[PDB]
Fold this sequence. Notes:
Function: Secreted effector that contributes strongly to virulence during infection by P.capsici.
GO cellular component, one term: extracellular region
Number of helices: 3
Organism: Phytophthora capsici
Bound molecules: magnesium ion
Number of domains: 1
Structural class: mainly beta
Main location: secreted
Subcellular location: Secreted
Oligomer: monomer
Amino acid sequence: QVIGHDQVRPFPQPKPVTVSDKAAVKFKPQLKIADGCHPYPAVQKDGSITGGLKWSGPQDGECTGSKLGSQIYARSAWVNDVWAIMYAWYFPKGRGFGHRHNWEYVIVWIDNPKSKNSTILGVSMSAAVGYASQTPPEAMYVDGDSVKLEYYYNHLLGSTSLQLTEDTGEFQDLITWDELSKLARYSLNHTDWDETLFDLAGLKMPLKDGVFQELLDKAWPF
Ligand SMILES: [Mg+2]
């Protein structure tokens, strides 16, 4: 069930059909890698999951990107009359000393996914302190409908985190929660990504059942 990180095959990004999928594609964020790994696929169609990378401090030529591509994930829901799109990225390891595996996320809060004029009302993310929310995001941080984020090491908090940025970032093929295979969805609901005995690394998969809704309520920026 566990396969090499550099061998996990991403899902292709389908042409979106459902209202939920169309909105998730429309508002796909972009990601600039300032520090650490590029994002990787965590799971493939048959449910096999990535083995990630052991933490081994500074290393040249590890996790710069899979030969098979990359991935970004999204799950969406109505929260207090606002449509929340939570995007998540997986990385094979993460600093802050560090750990195998990593997850980061950005929530794009929009008014109405069904509207041709759907609009970003807010953004929240896995920031170094709190969720670094903006309601709405400043224009300098948004490229069209795409929020610009940076994956970085915050050296004051000692955390691997996301922040908004003016700089252009990279896009990844999007697979939405509803369009995952049953097997892949099971693996993401059920895998423990934290190797510590007492779960101290904060490595819950942010889109999974019983984390997803709770995170949306915690991050609520309005
Ligand atoms: Mg982090």
